[PDB]
Amino acid sequence: QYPLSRYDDRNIADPILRAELRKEVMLMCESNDKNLTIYYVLPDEQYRPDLLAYRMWGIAELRWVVTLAAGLEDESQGMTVGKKLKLPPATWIREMIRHFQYDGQVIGTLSI
Amino acid sequence: QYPLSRYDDRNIADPILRAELRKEVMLMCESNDKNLTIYYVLPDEQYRPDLLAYRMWGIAELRWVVTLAAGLEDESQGMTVGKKLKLPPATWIREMIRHFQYDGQVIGTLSI
Amino acid sequence: LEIQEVTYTVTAAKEFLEVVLSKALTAVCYKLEVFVTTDGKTTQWSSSTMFRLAGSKSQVYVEFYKPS
Amino acid sequence: TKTTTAPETDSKRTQLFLQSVSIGQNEIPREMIVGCTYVEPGELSGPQLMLMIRDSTAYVVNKLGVKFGTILTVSLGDPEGHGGILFSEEFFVLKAPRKDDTVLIYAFSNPVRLLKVPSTSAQYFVDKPPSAVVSSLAPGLKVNADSFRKTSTYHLNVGEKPTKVLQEIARDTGSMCWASRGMINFKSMEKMANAAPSLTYESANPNTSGFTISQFNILNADYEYQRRHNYRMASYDMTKGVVYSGNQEDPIKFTSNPDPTALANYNKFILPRLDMLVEGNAALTPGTTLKIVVHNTAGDGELDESIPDKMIVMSVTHFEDRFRFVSRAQLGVVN
Amino acid sequence: TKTTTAPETDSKRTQLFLQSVSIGQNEIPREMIVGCTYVEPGELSGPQLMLMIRDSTAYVVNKLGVKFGTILTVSLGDPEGHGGILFSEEFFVLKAPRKDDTVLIYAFSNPVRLLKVPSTSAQYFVDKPPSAVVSSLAPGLKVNADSFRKTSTYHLNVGEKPTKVLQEIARDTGSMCWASRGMINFKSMEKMANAAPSLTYESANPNTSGFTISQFNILNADYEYQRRHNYRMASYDMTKGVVYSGNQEDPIKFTSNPDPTALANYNKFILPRLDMLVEGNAALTPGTTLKIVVHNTAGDGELDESIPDKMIVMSVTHFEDRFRFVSRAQLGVVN
Amino acid sequence: KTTPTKDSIRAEFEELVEKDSFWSKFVGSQFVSMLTLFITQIVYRCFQYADAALAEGFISTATRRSS
Amino acid sequence: SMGSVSGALGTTSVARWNSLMVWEGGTPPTFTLPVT
Amino acid sequence: APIAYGVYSQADGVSPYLKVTLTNSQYQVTGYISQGAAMNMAQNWESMGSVSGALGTTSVARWNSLMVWEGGTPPTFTLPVTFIALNNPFIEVSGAIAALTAMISPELKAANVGGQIPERVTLNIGRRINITDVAIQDLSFDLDAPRDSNGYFLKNTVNLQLTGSSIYNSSDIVRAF
Amino acid sequence: FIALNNPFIEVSGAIAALTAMISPELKAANVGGQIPERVTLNIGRRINITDVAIQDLSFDLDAPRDSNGYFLKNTVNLQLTGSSIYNSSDIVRAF
Secondary structure (H helix, E strand, C coil), rough: CCCCCCCCCCHCCCCCCCCHHHHHHHHHCCCCCCCCEEEEEEEHHHCCCHHHHHHCCHHHHHHHHHHHHHHCCCCCCCCCCCCCCEEECCHHHHHHHHHHCCCCCCCCEEEE | CCCCCCCHHHHHCCCCCCCHHHHHHHHHCCCCCCCCCECCCCCCCCCCHHHHHHHHHCCCHHHHHHHHHHCCCCCCCCCCCCCEECCHHHHHHHHHHHHHHHCCCCEECCCC | CCCCCCEEEEEECCCCCCCCEEEHHHHHCCCCCEEEEEEEEEEEEEECCCCCCCCCCCCECCCCCCCC | CEEEECCCCCCCCCCCCCEEECCEEECHHHHEEEEEEEEEEECCCCCEEEEECCCCCCCCCCCCCCCCCCCEEEECCCCCCCCCCCCEEEEEEECCCCCCCCEEEEEEHHHHHHCCCCCCCCCEEEEEHHHHHHHCCCCEEEECCCCCCCEEEEEEECCCCHHHHHHHHHHCCCCEEEEEECCCCCCCCCCHHCCCEEEEEEECCCCCCCCCCCEEEECCCCCCHHHCCCEEEEEEECEEEEEEEEECCCCEEECCCCCCHHHHHHHHHEEEEEEEECCCCCCCCCCCEEEEEEEECCCCEEECCCCCCEEEEEEEEEEEECCCEEEEEEEECCC | CCCCCCCCCCCCCCCEEEEEECCCCCEHHHHHHHEEEEEEEECCCCCEEEEEEEECCCCCCCCCCCCCHHHHEEECCCCCCCCCCCCEEEEEEEEEEEEEEEEEEEEEEEHHHHCCCCCCEEEEEECCHHHHHHHCCCCCCCCEECCCCCCCCCCCCCCCCCHHHHHHHHHCCCCCEEECCCEEEEEECHHHHCCCCCEEEEECCCCCCCCCCCEHHHHHHHHHHHHCCEEEECCCCCCCCCEECCCCCCCEECCCCCCCCHHHHHHHHHHEEEEEEECCCCCCCCCCEEEEECCCCCCCCCEEECCCCEEEEEEEEEEECCCCCEEEEEEEEEE | CCCCCHHHHHHHHHHHHHHCCCHHHHHCCCCHHHHHHHHHHHHHHHHHHHHHHHHHHHHCCCCCCCC | CCCCCCCCCCCCCHHHHHHCCCCCCCCCCCCCCCCC | CCEECCCCCCCCCCCCEEEEECCCEEEEEECCCCCCCEEEEEEECCCCCCHHCCCCCCCCCCCCCCCCCEEEEEEEEEEEEECCCCCCCHHHEEEEEEEHHHHHCCCCCCCCCCCCCCCEEEECCCCCCCEEEEEEEEEECCCCCCCCCCCCCCCEEEEEEECCCCCCCCHHHCCCC | CCCCCCCHHHHHHHHHHHHHHCCCCCCCCCCCCCCCCEEEEEECCCEEEEEEEEEEEEECCCCEECCCCEECCCCCCEEEECCCCCCCHHHHCCC
């Protein structure tokens, strides 16, 4: 068998239900919390989000976060050199993927 | 009672049912797998497959494998000196013998 | 009569692709029917004696009995 | 009302097996926990947990109020080790004594705790399919079943646990039960014997492509478990007379249900064979089938034929101390 | 068919207690056995055995196939030590786990194993003498009895061991049972109190002509065993009414058999007094009467009057390791 | 499989390769792994592009202000 | 350490193999360096 | 054919009676004898006995009046070998240490189970004491020895502990001399 | 030991003899012969003990050697013990 990493957003099989997780991640990446890191796109990371993911977190499967935060749809378009990005830690995104993968409910849902 | 070594092909009592195990061994010996060993027939091993079986594996009861791979029905027929042989490891042979002794089904059978 | 099924997927074209049932299932057997499903369409494949008059498009198969 | 909130960004630390423990929306610092023992059994005895927490300042019991009825939110997983799985469960605390500036917390899984409560009033299911009974008794778990055939009648008296009826259903259907990770499982015994393995465990082989066993125990006492099931069942039916089932050369034993299908499955079980200790795999759950290869470490490297090729997992115990993560399993074969 | 063959001439070695072990006509090398424990109890619980065999090459269980149903031929004796006796017996293996390159074999004596099998069908003996019942239940042992007087009725139900009926016969006759060395023994309790001793055991005497005790235990708890037998028996008989037996100042207790001879012997037993450990005597079997003399080792060499002069052996345990041969016994007095 | 990992594509190549004189020799080797990874990159790009565009198509499920 | 007894021996090969010393484990190399 | 090392040659003028050789299927190491070599053996003679059970049939059954035998050990050795270079430092001093270090280690990548155990050597002290199947247990050497201009040792000293593989009988141990 | 006339008889044979006396004989048929044999010790001419057991032995390997390879001098360290607890009257007889 060939499993998937716990950091992959593909863990949610429906491309429409992944919109909640993507929205939450992007909303976090535009906020100003105290646990955020500031990273500039180096001249050699214009076409390679994998290199940025490896240099920032040490995990290479988080390239979808880097693609999402830059505002792109494909990896074939180059990012602008010198764009400021803010990235959250890996544990948060990992539990966020798990949340929508399992609970799926929206943050703030009222239950009895 | 005289116990038969666990590496003997006589472990299957029917000469017709042993044909499937022999076919599997011969099919493996002719493949191009990555954990086979290449052995050339030396001038003093022309009539003695037991010496080759002892020199390669360290077990003398594996002479039937050498006779099979070389392409002879009789042990008194001399092998061609310098013939290239490919021979598998011993644990694989033991596992195949156990499977065909205690289960006796074709490798690609479908069960429910 | 009771009905039970088993399925096998194809990874590549092996040019004969023999499929063998288990000993217990062959012990209790009355009929055999073969279906092939490709891009959402499924059809029966008829049997033939050897391959006597079919070629290059006919959907046929041949039954055989192993020594076991 | 209960609100679903997002995880906090202050938890940047990754651990081996135990990731975080919380009481409501407040977190117990993880460095204070020095022990952890998680047990997944092969019957309806539910997953268990036990935490040893160092408390010298009198904080866990005094100011947090940990006693009977406290609900813990525990995140267990191993996203980097041998098996990259991750899940969250809720636990219910039964007792927590304090000794030597330390607290030992004994917890039970909440969905199964609700199934281990004595009944205030009696419920009878007359001529109901087993699926309805299972759904009505445990309405909070997903049902995974493949061995339901007929319909029958079940009774739950006053003071009896609902788990008794589920175990009776399992015995009548001939399946294996265990509730873990949000599911309740019924799996037939005849189909388990024909299942292909998923993992490979080897000993005395350092060039293996699978994992490795460090310690193992061989049990040769097969009579100890077969002694209790060596009987010929008999029962009384008002329209047929006396109904027998089983062998012909065994002593007779009387039961009450005169159902031939239930009588036939009365003597099916799994025979334990081997116990082994490995290096912390979090993917080992009951119901798993493994391939085991054991080599000898002296003489001439002979394979041990006394251990069968394919085995089923029956019980799993995971254990983490402050330095190492270990797992223990019990393996068995279907009779 | 089974053939009786002569012993081989390749066994030139003499040992202390365990002489040789064989499985059929093949011999396990004796130097591989590192433990041995042989137990002869004073009731019908049969002689037991336990062997610890060092197996690092995986030979005993793997290639010889030792599991439930293996019959061992064991030669036990001591032809040179304190007691020059020698005999051969057959044992039946129940289980044999393997741990740490070692195998522990648990065995039971075959003639008694056949007596400890649950009955597939019920047998009733109506108005039969006890000798016929004993011969029919155990047709493979020699009968040694002196306390059979009358005739009565006995019942053996489905699932019950044949040993239960023999124990009931012993209780009704007032005798002591033990099956050892190819015989089954019934010996009356009243005649045992008047038997002359055969051996002499002394302590703190280095000029003794007998043997010597190295360690001994004094038990003063005579109420612990007399508590259960302090009752006045009563039962119902359809032609006599209520039948009493026993003392007059004790509480009443009901049984079922209204037989005056059986009622009279209901409260007879042997009271244990002393446990001792000696230097490996192989002539000590249950039923033996010994003379015991104990001197004190300080003060003024006063004799201990709290130990009676004549005692009976109740249980015997023999034990051999790789360096020393030891025996342990439990001694008692008839009430 | 709908979700292509490197292992799945390498396994597909290995399954297709066998029973050939030339290719079966190099089943386990560095070159095959590098080639398979280099090819998997395009498949990953196409699948993720389709998913992202489908998600961002609607207003209700759009993740960016510009869309 | 201690050898053994109740035996010696005149099937046979396996008995001797058990008697032979056993290999139990090892230790990685260590150093003691007084730098200056 | 094993590979030679150490001071095996006769260019130095020392008799073979003052040299120790360790031989196995891969390497052969030769060195001198220093001032602290020795050979050791031991037996164990003896709790369960008491004063009240003594006396003022074989002698083995009476363990309360006589002494009993429990076991013994195989012969042990402590050899502080010495090497000194005279012609080529690598094959004499800097190669022997590596050879010994290889002989003490296991080989876990071999196919058979018996090939993974550290191998056993043959010990021959001078020309008159020869023992087979000797297992190497400990080893040590110093790191402040004089160095050559190329960085190889010009002298060294190795301390070894060796043990037997079985308990010897009275008739067999005489043959070793 | 120190050799004066014949090294093999005086220095190199004594060590082999002692190494023979210390070890058991496990190929023997009877049980009493399997335990190592006991020795008679006589210290000078005035102290005699019977049935002593040797429990340790040692000797040097850096001793002077002969042109044929035999020892010319050596030293053996021995540890000996009695085989029973002596009585007051018995132990005086040893002197």
